[PDB]
Symmetry: C5
Subunit: 338 residues, 5 copies
C-alpha cells in the first residue's frame, strides 16, 4: 500500500494538492495505457474527418456524430458503475479484517505454557509456529504475491516456517482439498499434550488458548470465502461493456464538427475536447480502481503488503514466547505514588 | 460459482477485457433467450411499419411512436430496479456466511475427546457425523441442488451420512415440522455421555464443545430464515413490470421513423438501434442477475457449490478426528533457535 | 409469509413472469382499493372536461392542466419515498432476527439437567416452558396476530403455556409495567434450584445455561425496542403527502387536452393514460409495501407467521427435553471405517 | 416518543391517512413557525410587487425573478440534505441500543447471590442499585430531560438512587472528569466481597456477574461517545445554508410574474404557489426532522422517554432481586404430560 | 472536537441558525483560504474582460464562455465527490470506536488482584500502567497530536507512563517493527506472576483479566489498520481533480457576458455570481470536510481530542485500582425497604 495518512492529518490549503504530484500508486499509473489508446483513437478519427473524407462523405459523418451524441446518454454508466464500485469497496476493507494476526494467541502462549527449560521453550515456539503456518498456507492460496514467494512447499521449509519432519507428516495426510486446516489441528493437539504433561496449569487456561485458535481459524475461513466466492462474473462483464461502449460512442459523438455548417452546439472548434478527456478520466478512472481492489492480495502498488506482514508476524511471535516469557522489568514505584 | 480472482490480481490493460470472452457464468448465457425475443419483436414491428402499413396508416404509427418515446421516461426504471438489486445483493453474501463449517467443532473434538481404542475412535467419528448431518438436513431444505442429490432420507443412509439404526430413531421421533434440529440434540447428549464415561476431562472442556454446537445451530437457523422469509413477492412483481413495461414501450417508441417527414430527433435511419439494444443489455441485464442471486442455492452456474462443500466437510471432519487425534509430528528445533 | 424461494432457484425465461399471476401476497391485492379510486377520480375529471364544461370554461381548464403538468415535478417524490423505503426495509429483517428461538437453550437443558425419574422429567419441562412463556408474553405485546389468539392471560393458561398455579404468582407480582421479564427470572431461579439439588453437575454447566437465557432475554428486548421506538411519525406524514399530492396533481395535469388547440406535447388523444397509470403503480406501489412492512407482526399476507412459530417452538422444545433426554441411537461403525 | 405501531399493523386503505390528522409529534408542530415566516415573507414580496413598485421598476424585478428561478437549481439541496439525513438516522437507532438495561444483571444477581436473611437481602438490593446508578449518572450527562429532573446530586439522594453515606464517598473521590464510572467499580468490589463471605458460590458464577457489569459499562461508554463526538459542526452549518439559501431564492424566483408581458412559463396567475409551498414542506421538512433526531435525549415529543425508563428500571430491578429471589411457583404437571 | 449536542437537544426555530454564527470548527475557517483565491481569480478574469480585451477579442472570450458553460456538466462532480465522502465518514466513526478505554480492565484489576499492603498496591498500579502504555504507544504512531507531545521515548518516561527500568527493557528488546505490542505482553506475564504468588485467586478470574487484555489488544490493532491501510491514493487524486477542474471551468463559464449581444441566458448583468459562489461553498465545502476527517487524529479543531483522553485514562485507572480497591461505602437500607 501507499500510506499518506501522516501527510493529511491537518487541512490547510494544499492538503490534497500535494498528493496529485505523486506517481507511485496513482491514477496516472493506472490509466496511462488506456488513456493513450483513447487519445490516439480520437485523433485518428479527427484527422481522417478533416483530411481524408470528401465533401459528400463528411456530411454522412456529421449525421452519425449527432446521432451518437444524443443517444449515448441511454447507456446508464453512472448507474452501472456506481453499483459495481460499491461492491468492490465493501469487500475491500472486509478482506483486510480477515487477515489473521497472531497477537491474541501470542499473549496467551507466552504466559500460560510454563517452563524455562529447553522443552517448554521448544513447546511455546512450536505452538506459535503452527499458528503462523496456518496463516501462510491460506495466504499462498489467496495471494499471488505470497505464492510467487513460496511456489512449492519446499520453499516453506527453507524459510523456517516448517521443519522437514513436519513436511513428511503434511504429505502423508491424504486429502484432495486445500490443506490450510492442518496446522490448526496440530495446534490444538499440541496444546492438549502440553496440558497432560503439566505445562498448562488448568483447563480454563487451555480453553482460553483453544478459543483464540478457533478465532484465527475463522479468520482463515473468511479469506477462503472471498477468494472462492468472487464478485459475480456477470457483474464484471456488464460494467466493462458499460464503460467501453460509452467511450466508443464518444469517439464519434464528441468530434468537433464543421462550424460553417452551423449545427446547434458545435459552434466552436478547439481541436481538443477537454471535457471529454476529463470525462474519460473519471468514468474509466473508477473502473481502473475497481480492477485494482477486486483482488487486494495481488502485486499492485496499492494492494495489501502480505509478504511484509508474514515477516512481521513470524518475528514478533517467536520474540514474545521465547525472549519474553518471564522476562519482566523490575516492579518500581511510579511518578504518582503518594 | 465461477472463480476468476486469480486472473484479476493485478490491473494492467485487459484486466476485465479478457473476462468478456468467457461463456460460462456470463451475461451472454443469462440474457440469450430474452434478447432474441426482444430483437425479433422489434424487427417484426419495424418490417410491418416499412412494408405492410399504408400511407394513411403509417402516420397513425408515427404519432404513437412519438407519444411512447416522450412518456416512457415516466416509468422509474432505475429507481425501482436500483432498490431491488440492493436487496438481492445484501442477502447474497449474508447467506454464504450462514453456511455452516465443521472446522471449529472439528478442532475441539479432535483433541478433547480422549481415547485411542476402538470406542473413543467410534465416539469422535459419531460426534462429527452428527454435526455434518445437522448441516445436510438444512441444506436439502434450502437448496435444490442438494435435494436432487438426496431426494429421500434413504439416499442419506446410502451416502454414509446416517447409519440405518439412526434412520429408525429419526422416524420414530414424531414431529410435523422440519427435523434439522434432531442431530444437534443427539450431539449434545452424546458429548455429555462422553464426559460421564471419562472421555472428556472437565466441564470447561465440555462447555467449549457445546458452545461450538450452538454456534453451528445458529448458522443453520439463519439458512432457515432466508429460505422461509423471502424477498417480498410485492417487490418481485413490481420490478418485473417496471423492466418489461419499459421495453414494451421501446418496441414502439424506439422505431426509426420516416426521415422524409422530418421529425425532431428522427433525422437519421440506421435500421438497428444500437443504443436501445445496449439499454436492454443493462436494464434487463441487472434483472437477470437478480433472478440468479435471489436463491443462490439453486443450480445456476454462479450459485453456491453446495454439493461440493458437503463432500469437503465430510472428508475433512472424519480425517481430523480419526487420523489426526494424537498424530503429531516430532518436536524439532526450528531454523531460528539461538 | 408467501414463500416462493423453491420456484426461483434457477433463472431460465419466465423466472419472475410466472410469479405475476399469483394473487395471494401480491401487489394486485394491496393496490386494489387505491387504484380504483385513482381510476374513477381520473375518468370523472375527464368526462366532466369533455361533456360538461363550456367552450369558454374548457380553456380555463387547459391553462391549469399545463401549469400542474410542469410544476408537479417540484414534488421530490423519489427523494422522499426512496429514503422512507430504506428505513422500513432496514428494520424489516432486523425484527425477524429478534424473534427468539428456544433451540440453543433446548440443547443445553436436554443434556445437562440430569434425571430420568419423574422429578427431573418435570424439571426440564418447566425450564423450557418458562423460556417459551418469556417469548409469548413479548409477542402478544408486539404482534396483533398473537394478541387476537391470546386476548387475556386466561387464554394462555388454556393453551398449556402456563399452569394455574403460575397465573396466581404472575398476578401477585405487582408491577405497573410490561411483565414479559417475569418468566426469564423464574428460569434462572429454577436452574440454580436445580443445581443445589444435584441435577446440574457443575457451575460451568449452570453458567452456560444462564448465558443462553440472557441471550434470549436480549432477543425479547429488541422486539420491545422496535415496537416502542417506531419510525418517527414526522417521516410517515411526509411520505403520505408526497405520494398523495403528486397524484392529486396528476388528476389535472395528465388529462388529455384538446388536439385541435395544438398544445406542445398534447398532440394525441388516447383516452387512457397508460404511462400515468403505470407511474401510479410504482410510486403508490412502494408506499403500500412500506405500509405492509412497517409492522411485520400484523395480519397481512406477507407479515411474519408468529402464531405458527409459537406452535413450532412449544412442540419442539418439549420433545427434545422429554423424549430425547438420554434416548440416543446405538453407536455403530459407519460406511467409512477402514 | 409517539407510538403508532398498533395502528399500522395491517394495510387496508387509510393506513397512513388516519395518521396525518394527529398533532402530537407531527410535521405540523415542527414546521409551524418556519412555515408562517416563509408564507409571510412570500406574500410581502408579492404585495410589494403588485402595489408599490412602479412600471419602470416592476421590469427590474421581472429580470431578477427569471435569473433567480433559472440558477437556484445550482444549489445541490437534495445532495447536501440527503447526505445529512443519512448521518442523523444512522446515529439515531444506534443511541437507542446504547441505553443500558438492568435485566441481564438482574437475572444473575437474583439467583446467584444467596441468602434470605436481612443481610443477603441488603446485598442484592445494593448491587442492583449500583447498576442503576451507573446508568443514571451517564443519562444525566447526555440527556437534558434527565438533567432537569436531577439538577444536582442532592436530587439523586432524594429519589432513593443513592444513600447519604454513598454521597460522601462519591464526593471524597477527587476526579476532575465525569464520574459515571464510580458505581460500576463499587459493583465489582461488592460482588467480590459477596463471594469472600460465601454469598456467591463459585468463581464461575462471580465472573458471569462481572461479565454483565462490563457489558453495561460498554453501553454507558457508547452513550458517552455519541454525546461527546457530535456530528461535525461543519456538516450542520452547510445543510442550514443549503436549505435556507434555496428558499431565500424562491422568495424572488417563484413569484407570479405579469401575464401581460408573456414570459415563458409565467402564463398563469394564481396568487398562491402550491408547488412551492409543498417544496418547502419537504426540503425544510427533512431539515426539521434532523433537528429533532440529532439529540434524541432532549425534550421533543419524539425524543426518547428516558425519565420513564429510569422509573421502570429501578422498580423492576428491586422487584426481581428482593421479592423474587427464591419465590418460585409450585412445580406442576402441565397440560401435555402423557 | 467542538461539542454542540447540549444546544440542539430541542428543535424550536433557530436550532441550527444559532450555530452558523460560530467560528471555531466551522466551514468559514476551513474554506477561508480557498474561497479568497476563487473570488480573486474570478474578479481578475471579470475585470480583464471588461477593461483590457478589445472588441474583436471580447467576442473570442464570449465563445469560450459559452463552450465552458455547456460542457462543464460532463464532469461528474456529485458522483465522484458523493462516493468519496461516504468513504471518509464510514471510516470516521469506526476509528473513534477503535480508541481503547481502560475501564473494562480497570473493573477487574481493582477487585480480583488482592492485597492492601504495599506490594499488592504496587502490583495493581503496574498492571493498569501497562494497559495505558500499550495505548499510548499506538496513539503516538497514529496521531500527530500525541507525537508532538511525546516526540521521543524519553518524554514518555518524564510523564510517569514508564519507569526508567522499563525503558532499558524496552530498548533491549530488538525488533525492527513497531513495538506497541510490548506492554500488552508484559501485562499477561505479570498477571500470571500475580496468580502464582496468590494475589489472583482462581484461574477463571485470571482468564477474565486476560480476555479484557486481548480485547484492548484488538482495539490497538484496529487503530494500526486504519493508519496503515489508508483510503487509496487513486481515490484522493480523482476527487481533487473533479472539484478543482469543475471550478476552473467556472472561472470562464460563469462570467457575466455582454447583455447587448443578447445571448440566451446572459440577459442580466449583476457583477457578482451569487449562485456560483454558493455552488463553490458546497462542492468545495464537502471536499474540505473530507480533508479534515480523513485523519481524525491530527490537530484540526474537530479532530479527536486524544491528548485529553490520555490524561483522563491515566488518572481514572490509577484512581480505581489504588484509592478504590476495598474502599466501599457502608451498606445501608435504601428509601424503598418495606
Ligand atoms: Ca489488485
Ligand atoms: Ca439461483
Ligand atoms: Ca403489516
Ligand atoms: Ca431532540
Ligand atoms: Ca484531521
Amino acid at each position: 500500500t501507499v500510506t499518506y495518512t501522516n501527510r493529511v492529518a491537518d487541512a490547510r490549503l494544499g492538503t490534497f494538492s500535494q498528493l496529485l504530484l505523486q506517481w507511485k500508486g496513482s491514477i496516472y499509473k493506472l490509466l496511462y495505457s488506456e488513456f493513450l489508446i483513447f487519445i490516439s483513437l480520437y485523433f485518428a478519427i479527427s484527422l481522417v474527418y478533416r483530411l481524408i473524407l470528401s465533401e459528400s462523405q463528411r456530411l454522412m459523418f456529421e449525421k452519425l456524430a449527432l446521432y451518437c451524441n444524443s443517444y449515448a446518454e441511454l447507456i446508464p454508466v453512472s448507474f452501472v458503475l456506481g453499483f459495481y464500485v460499491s461492491l468492490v469497496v465493501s469487500r475491500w476493507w472486509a478482506q483486510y479484517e480477515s487477515i489473521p494476526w497472531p497477537d491474541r494467541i501470542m499473549n496467551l502462549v507466552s504466559c500460560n505454557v510454563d517452563g524455562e527449560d529447553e522443552y517448554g521453550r521448544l513447546l511455546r515456539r512450536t505452538l506459535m509456529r503452527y499458528s503462523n503456518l496456518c496463516s501462510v498456507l491460506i495466504l499462498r492460496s489467496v495471494s499471488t504475491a505470497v505464492y510467487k514467494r513460496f511456489p512449492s512447499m519446499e520453499h516453506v521449509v527453507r524459510a523456517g516456517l516448517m521443519t522437514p519432519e513436519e513436511h513428511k507428516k503434511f504429505e502423508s495426510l491424504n486429502s484432495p482439498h486445500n490443506k490450510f486446516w492442518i496446522p490448526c489441528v496440530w495446534f490444538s493437539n499440541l496444546a492438549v499434550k502440553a496440558r497432560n504433561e503439566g505445562r498448562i496449569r488448568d483447563s480454563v487456561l487451555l480453553q482460553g488458548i483453544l478459543n483464540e485458535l478457533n478465532t484465527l481459524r475463522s479468520q482463515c475461513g473468511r479469506l477462503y470465502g472471498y477468494d472462492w466466492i468472487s464478485i459475480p462474473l456477470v457483474y464484471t462483464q456488464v460494467v466493462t461493456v458499460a464503460v467501453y461502449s460509452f467511450f466508443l460512442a464518444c469517439l464519434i459523438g464528441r468530434q468537433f464538427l464543421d462550424p460553417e455548417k452551423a449545427y446547434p452546439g458545435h459552434e466552436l472548434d478547439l481541436f481538443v475536447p477537454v471535457f471529454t478527456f476529463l470525462q474519460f478520466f473519471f468514468y474509466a478512472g473508477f473502473l481502473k480502481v475497481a480492477e485494482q481492489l477486486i483482488n487486494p492480495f495481488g502485486e499492485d502498488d496499492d494492494d495489501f503488503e502480505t509478504n511484509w506482514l508474514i515477516d512481521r508476524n513470524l518475528q514478533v511471535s517467536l520474540m514474545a514466547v521465547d525472549e519474553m516469557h518471564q522476562d519482566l522489568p523490575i516492579l518500581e514505584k511510579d511518578l504518582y505514588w503518594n
